[PDB]
Write an enzyme that holds these catalytic residues in place. Sequence first.
Site, PDB file in Angstrom:
ATOM      1  N   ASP A 178       0.842  -1.186   0.000  1.00  0.00           N
ATOM      2  CA  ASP A 178       0.000   0.000   0.000  1.00  0.00           C
ATOM      3  C   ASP A 178       0.885   1.246   0.000  1.00  0.00           C
ATOM      4  OD1 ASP A 178       0.842  -0.849   2.471  1.00  0.00           O
ATOM      5  OD2 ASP A 178      -0.874  -0.013   3.552  1.00  0.00           O
TER       6      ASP A 178
HETATM    7  P1  LIG Z   1      -1.554   4.636   2.149  1.00  0.00           P
HETATM    8  O1  LIG Z   1      -2.527   4.489   1.005  1.00  0.00           O
HETATM    9  O2  LIG Z   1      -1.442   3.410   3.034  1.00  0.00           O
HETATM   10  O3  LIG Z   1      -2.065   5.855   3.064  1.00  0.00           O
HETATM   11  C1  LIG Z   1      -1.923   7.199   2.541  1.00  0.00           C
HETATM   12  C2  LIG Z   1      -2.770   8.142   3.384  1.00  0.00           C
HETATM   13  C3  LIG Z   1      -2.214   8.169   4.810  1.00  0.00           C
HETATM   14  C4  LIG Z   1      -2.678   9.550   2.787  1.00  0.00           C
HETATM   15  C5  LIG Z   1      -4.231   7.676   3.407  1.00  0.00           C
HETATM   16  O4  LIG Z   1      -4.498   6.824   2.306  1.00  0.00           O
HETATM   17  C6  LIG Z   1      -5.280   8.775   3.470  1.00  0.00           C
HETATM   18  O5  LIG Z   1      -6.025   8.959   2.511  1.00  0.00           O
HETATM   19  N1  LIG Z   1      -5.380   9.464   4.597  1.00  0.00           N
HETATM   20  C7  LIG Z   1      -6.319  10.563   4.771  1.00  0.00           C
HETATM   21  C8  LIG Z   1      -5.640  11.861   5.130  1.00  0.00           C
HETATM   22  C9  LIG Z   1      -4.456  11.693   6.057  1.00  0.00           C
HETATM   23  O6  LIG Z   1      -3.452  11.099   5.687  1.00  0.00           O
HETATM   24  N2  LIG Z   1      -4.516  12.258   7.264  1.00  0.00           N
HETATM   25  C10 LIG Z   1      -3.425  13.059   7.799  1.00  0.00           C
HETATM   26  C11 LIG Z   1      -2.753  12.387   8.967  1.00  0.00           C
HETATM   27  S1  LIG Z   1      -1.192  13.181   9.424  1.00  0.00           S
HETATM   28  C12 LIG Z   1      -0.793  12.290  10.888  1.00  0.00           C
HETATM   29  O7  LIG Z   1      -1.382  11.299  11.240  1.00  0.00           O
HETATM   30  C13 LIG Z   1       0.357  12.875  11.646  1.00  0.00           C
HETATM   31  C14 LIG Z   1       0.697  12.109  12.881  1.00  0.00           C
HETATM   32  C15 LIG Z   1       2.177  12.165  13.224  1.00  0.00           C
HETATM   33  C16 LIG Z   1       2.559  11.325  14.411  1.00  0.00           C
HETATM   34  C17 LIG Z   1       4.006  10.919  14.440  1.00  0.00           C
HETATM   35  C18 LIG Z   1       4.382  10.091  15.632  1.00  0.00           C
HETATM   36  C19 LIG Z   1       4.051  10.740  16.946  1.00  0.00           C
HETATM   37  C20 LIG Z   1       5.121  11.641  17.504  1.00  0.00           C
HETATM   38  C21 LIG Z   1       6.054  10.971  18.486  1.00  0.00           C
HETATM   39  C22 LIG Z   1       7.119  10.106  17.855  1.00  0.00           C
HETATM   40  C23 LIG Z   1       7.756   9.111  18.795  1.00  0.00           C
HETATM   41  C24 LIG Z   1       8.350   9.702  20.047  1.00  0.00           C
HETATM   42  C25 LIG Z   1       9.519  10.621  19.795  1.00  0.00           C
END
Ligand SMILES: *P(=O)(O)OCC(C)(C)[C@H](O)C(=O)NCCC(=O)NCCSC(=O)CCCCCCCCCCCCC
Lengths: 81, 242, 80, 67, 76, 186, 185, 122, 425, 238, 76
Positions: C37
């Site tokens: 994916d």
């Molecule tokens: P693929 O097809 O598998 O997936 C692609 C995506 C993800 C784009 C999806 O298909 C999708 O359509 N998603 C819808 C929109 C989306 O992606 N949403 C945005 C989310 S951004 C997000 O989740 C940011 C989170 C970051 C967290 C990082 C880790 C936490 C911080 C601490 C780190 C460890 C300690 C230091």
Amino acid sequence: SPFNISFFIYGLVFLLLDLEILLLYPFAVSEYVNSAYGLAAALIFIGIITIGFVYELGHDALKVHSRQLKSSVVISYLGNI
Amino acid sequence: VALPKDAPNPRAIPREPVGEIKQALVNPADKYQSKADNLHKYGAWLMSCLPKYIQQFSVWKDELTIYICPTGVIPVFSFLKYNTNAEFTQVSDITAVDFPTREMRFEIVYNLLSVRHNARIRVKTYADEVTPVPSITSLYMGANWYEREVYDMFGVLFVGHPDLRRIMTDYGFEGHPLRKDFPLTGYTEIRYDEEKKRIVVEPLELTQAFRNFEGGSSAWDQVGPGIDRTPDTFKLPTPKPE
Amino acid sequence: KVEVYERIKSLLAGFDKVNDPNNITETAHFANDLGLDSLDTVEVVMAIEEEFSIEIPDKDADQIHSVDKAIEYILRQPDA
Amino acid sequence: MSYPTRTLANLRKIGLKEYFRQLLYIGDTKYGELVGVDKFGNKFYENKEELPLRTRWVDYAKHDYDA
Amino acid sequence: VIVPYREEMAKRHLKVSGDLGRVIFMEFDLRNTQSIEESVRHSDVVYNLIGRDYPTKNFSLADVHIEGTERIVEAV
Amino acid sequence: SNAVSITKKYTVQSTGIWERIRRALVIDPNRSNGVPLNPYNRNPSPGDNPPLEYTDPVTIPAGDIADNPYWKRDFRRNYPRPSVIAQAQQVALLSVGSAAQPRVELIGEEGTKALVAAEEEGKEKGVAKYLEEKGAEEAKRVLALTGGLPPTPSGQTMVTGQWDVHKYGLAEEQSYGGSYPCRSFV
Amino acid sequence: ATPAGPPPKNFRLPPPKNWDEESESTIDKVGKYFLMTEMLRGMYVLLEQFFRPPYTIYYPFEKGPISPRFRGEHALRRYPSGEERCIACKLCEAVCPAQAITIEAEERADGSRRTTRYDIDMTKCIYCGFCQESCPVDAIVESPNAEYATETREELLYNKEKLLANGDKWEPELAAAIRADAPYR
Amino acid sequence: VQPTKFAVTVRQSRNWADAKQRVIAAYRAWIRAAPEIQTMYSIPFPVSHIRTRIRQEFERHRYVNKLNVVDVLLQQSNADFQETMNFWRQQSHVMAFFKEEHFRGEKRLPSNFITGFLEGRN
Amino acid sequence: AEPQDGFQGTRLIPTGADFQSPPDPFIDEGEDSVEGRKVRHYTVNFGPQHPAAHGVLRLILELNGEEIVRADPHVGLLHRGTEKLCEYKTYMQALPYFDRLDYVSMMTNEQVFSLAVEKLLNIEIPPRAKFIRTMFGEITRILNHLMSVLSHAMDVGALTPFLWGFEEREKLMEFYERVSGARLHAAYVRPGGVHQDIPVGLLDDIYQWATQFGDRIDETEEMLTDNRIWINRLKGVGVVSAADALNLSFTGVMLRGSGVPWDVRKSSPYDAYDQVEFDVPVGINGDCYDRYLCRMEEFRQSLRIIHQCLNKMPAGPVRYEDYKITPPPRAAMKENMEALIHHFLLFTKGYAVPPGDTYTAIEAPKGEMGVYVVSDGSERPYRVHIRAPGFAHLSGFDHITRGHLLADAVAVIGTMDLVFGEVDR
Amino acid sequence: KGKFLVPGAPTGLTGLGTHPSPRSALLYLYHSTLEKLKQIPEHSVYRQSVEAVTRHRLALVESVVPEGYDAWVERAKKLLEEHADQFDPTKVGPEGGEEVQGARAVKVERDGRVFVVSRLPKEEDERVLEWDGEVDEGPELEGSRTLEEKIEGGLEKIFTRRDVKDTVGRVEWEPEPQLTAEQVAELENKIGAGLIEEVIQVAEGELKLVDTMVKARVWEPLEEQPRPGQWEYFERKP
Amino acid sequence: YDQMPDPRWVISMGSCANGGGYYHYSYSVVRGCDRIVPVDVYVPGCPPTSEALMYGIFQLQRKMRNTKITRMWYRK
Ligand SMILES: *P(=O)(O)OCC(C)(C)[C@H](O)C(=O)NCCC(=O)NCCSC(=O)CCCCCCCCCCCCC
Ligand code: SF4
Ligand code: SF4
Ligand code: SF4
């Protein structure tokens, strides 16, 4: 990170000036026999090393001027064409 | 002790008697009606000059508030900064208020100061959990930390802000504490754990629970509706009889 | 080159998100053929970047969607 | 900070034994009139020619004096 | 938690573990029986972690382990 | 001179040979040493102020027993409501004027309906559309409200009797004179 | 920057003065530089202070001044008969800005309105005097005492026994402080 | 960038194509930084364990179909990334992110009805 | 149609970048070559553990050798959630929260919240309260400047003036303890006036201190004003122009040092400042030396105001005379039914404040302090936001320090009157 | 002595120096403002307001004339016609040229009126200036070079740069006479908006404002209606 | 606290340091520093007077004065 060249200059000018002071200490304990003739050479020696200090001061290797509203634009009205 | 020759005891001087003190009754709102007309005229002129973004204005005592749509934040504050009759060149304060009953729950409040005209103005816009506001950092350097505070306490995004990060809360803090739905003591608390040899976050647990005496609010309204003080130059004319 | 491919198998075969090993080819695609994916693909290019010790730009990484595309991309980069 | 004339006078009014004992707790040479004694045995003194806020003081009944 | 101690400055870190009133300190000597059983009469569980790998001027290995346990276990 | 006499400054003074020594050696003999006098300073202690002397004052309008009904001095419940003007209201204020200055006669009938016409028009078209239909003459009329020029923001001090800016001017007495880069504004 | 209207009279500074135009002689200028005149003058000020009386008092043998209004350790008071002044109104529990007071109450055996629990968390209390201001019977007061630092935090959780004992011990101060300031309350 | 090390100016996404690039860009920066994160906070876990947590954080929001909500999540990710790569977080903050290091465990909710009931609502 | 209009992202909202106008070019004044070599900066954390100038300050600096590249202050080490707590308190109960913001300027801090609440209450406080609050305002300004100027002097090495002037602090703290019962957190200025009247011997005791305070100011100026080490540490350091000071939200001395004549006590008079005479010190070079000279002259104008307040002090009540807002005298509360009810309600429910909002500002010792209060008509404020001058000032630290020497940072940290209870709240 | 204020002399407001040619700068700004406002409709109050303030202030700036202005204008007008190639921006660029050691000057047209902008070498100590302020572009590329790096080294500048002493075909631009210090004070007393330098600052900001207002089209219908209850607080029903 | 050499002591001064104080119910405040470090003396007041702080320092000195060091090792 890079280091500051002023630290090298302080040590350099200290050492070179420390040597010249050392070379004058025999004169201060021999002034009577040296009299006028030895004084001339001491003064010649002091004059030469003083010029190198002038170079030190004039070029500011210690960064003396390290830390520091004329307008370039003047406008003139001439009126209607 | 050796006293000063010309410094006598200031307690030893008898005071003239005071009798029937008389103080007149003052309504403190009356002194602002002298400028009530001028504040409405200034707000009206601003609305006429920027009708595309200024939805309404209000005058309370000597405070003029301007209500605008979020898209006009840059044009409206540019006008308040640079116009020759509006030289509000300082941002006194930027903050937010939360109103959960509103669809746009966040009210963004800007207070400006014009030293040249010795005047103040208030500008209000609105935002949501997912609807950002234009940053005014390009017009006011002082605005930088105020917008970070609004983002930290309320979760409001400012588009165009450089370095929009938390300013008050701890690193990795979850939630926006000035939201009405955020509880007073929050969700978690810290302590030093002697096994991990470090500080640990844990679910919040209070030895004595917070006691909210909000229920003691008066069962009767205590203020009333107040008084209308709109000037005559901003009230509509009335049809004469016959 | 061929030395890059033998290193490519060293990580894709070790990847636990492959639908079935030995499905790798000289021109196999991560999505269509290998059943990866979006994010599993992001991780695979990051594992290749580690092997050749060269950072890959995000635009260049988007271009890389097949085993051949990576083999071609690493050769162009001077570091390896 | 006593000054010579103050300390010399208080020494004469109190004696060297009392002077040294006072130097062992308060670290000064103080003399005044006894205002009274409390239930615990603390002695309280007044002298209105001292410096401000130093015109009243206590001599504690107990060696391990505590306020 | 009832903590019988000998040096006050040694046990200071233990208090941080519990809420107010949870970690209780008791001055104790292993040859003071009153102190051992004042530390135990309210408890429903007693841990004996008293040991020493070397003998001392005041305690042989038998004095701290055998006689030590015997006074504590009799209190239990 | 700048200094007040040491003889008027509520501090322990020197005496005899020591005052002459002090006046001969110090930089300024009029300067006090900051030691307060024990017979005058906090004497008596506030805890021995006679309680019967102090009288809690009452102002007779607010504190009378005869002619002060509470509702006449209830200034909290007489608080001003905020005066709110929306885009619809300003169009009406431009179309038919105000109660202090109307635009047309509006005499009884055919004026009540005329007045409500100015309201529904204000609701439908905002200030911008209203001005655009009417043209530049209306724009000059908005500025005609403020006397041709656009208005200026109200000031926040009433010392001169009107709301205005405070007229900062250099004080006739410069505390540093001109020897230092700080100027006294009155 | 300047207020609206014409520029304030003489607001504009005159042009800077060149070295040539300085109205100060060379000998004075050179003398101050090499002799450090203003530094010598500052040192002379210290000697003047060196011979002035110090402000230090020798605590705990002497004490600094406090007023009848001083807000220190809390106490519960009695009537001259010895009956408790407290009638469990809960005014101090309601006004408390820090929620430091906890009260429970019922009818006493004689039917009197009295407290069963009266706790003050001295590690929550901000020493503001609001309880003492709100009390209609002068039951809760702050004593002048400030020297009650404790070994453990649990010693700062005052219950009704601790507070009534404090009032019994401090009553003559409590009455004297009330006597001096009640006209202003 | 200009204000401080990892500062990203707040901008809206133009379209869903724009948003997806940022999300993949954000994930790429996160899992790339995982080796540095381990040695910088002395995390007692392998980079594999850390990188799994990164994916799950991105998978909680995989189903978002609203562009404005994505912009909010992207801004949060940049803020967390900056305060991690700058040593602004402390080991306590990053360690609290790993749910295993709580003395009551990671399975902090009952497995089923009867285990929670026998213990007393978990 | 927000925020569903953002569900599919139509009509991006205009930023400040979309309104950048190119400058008028006519009148606009603004190989292994070693010039292309980059220079690596080292980033040093200062505080709060490693000693700093004062307070809970983590100052993160990017340095180029000795010069400051970027200055990044991290605050919130004293963020205590004061603004949220005020929403669970009555207006009476929220007042002590203001003592603890700028906690060397307690009475003016509580003054700004009293004036804002008095404005929404629509009440005029009695004249004696106005003069007491103005008098204590300038006593509190001197207390603050004694702390600010002298501790700033102590940071650059000048030990002695701090010792001399803190005895002056002790004398003025006695006046705070005589009126209230506290050295610092008096909770004395309340909406409606002040808590209680001043004891009958206070004015004369203030007067006696006033006859000797000028000498205390002068002896402080003997060690600093002409001292060439002091001048060389302050002159040309922390310069901000008049234009940038306004755009950075600088108020008070941080603004007046750059030549702008502006004082809130003059521009928008409150309490009795319209009834007193005083001058406003204004600098011209906008540097640490000008700001030091403005603060030293503010000492003398504060004393000048205090002397006028001593002579103009009128007779009468110190609390607004409506027992629906201010508590009745204790003798009234124990005597008549009406007073006892009003006492009961004010200490359990609190007074109700008419709905609305106001931004009220005063000239605090550290600059323009403001408070923004929203009233919902109830006895608890809906929203209390505090505008702290130190917050705006510290936000300008990068602007005033970039390109300058690390050895001047202590000078400008002290030139800003920085207490972090103000900054973080 | 104090007849004319000194350019760069501190005004009193930190960072605000005395203006070099303040009267012409105001004329330039005001005229540039009126021309830039011609792209706004006539029913915009914003345009009507800026016009009223600017044309009123413009009238006052024209009301103060530097001594000998008429004498200067005739020659200066006469100088533009005979040497137009020396001052036209299309040839020497908006800065007047790449020569900083020399004097530059450009004719410019605003609001139907013509202005000449002049630039002068900064007065610097002779002990510190090298080659009379000529810009150092490093050394030339010696050795075995390709044609491409030669063009990247500005070799074509050899055929177009002019030696600073070389003034055969060009003329010296003469500055406009300046308002006296007395004239500046009485003019700014007429404007009543602070020092001349502050008034120029306000004109520069007001000129900048027009572009934002045009790009935002602030004179058109309200962009977004307030949805019901948007601005409803806790006000009691009267 | 970890960087302080032994012997060392902690004095909690003020209601906030003691139990949280006026901000005990805040989301951002530690409800007493004894959750973080062990405390030897608690000084009450918000703020304690300078004399009240001095009284607490006297208590800690009296605590040091009664500390048994060479006799504690001599007991065991
Ligand atoms: P693929 O097809 O598998 O997936 C692609 C995506 C993800 C784009 C999806 O298909 C999708 O359509 N998603 C819808 C929109 C989306 O992606 N949403 C945005 C989310 S951004 C997000 O989740 C940011 C989170 C970051 C967290 C990082 C880790 C936490 C911080 C601490 C780190 C460890 C300690 C230091
Ligand atoms: S102490 Fe006073 S206010 Fe509190 S419950 Fe007792 S009587 Fe009521
Ligand atoms: S002094 Fe203030 S905080 Fe302490 S118990 Fe009384 S009301 Fe509560
Ligand atoms: S004075 Fe009160 S609020 Fe301030 S730090 Fe001390 S306990 Fe906390």
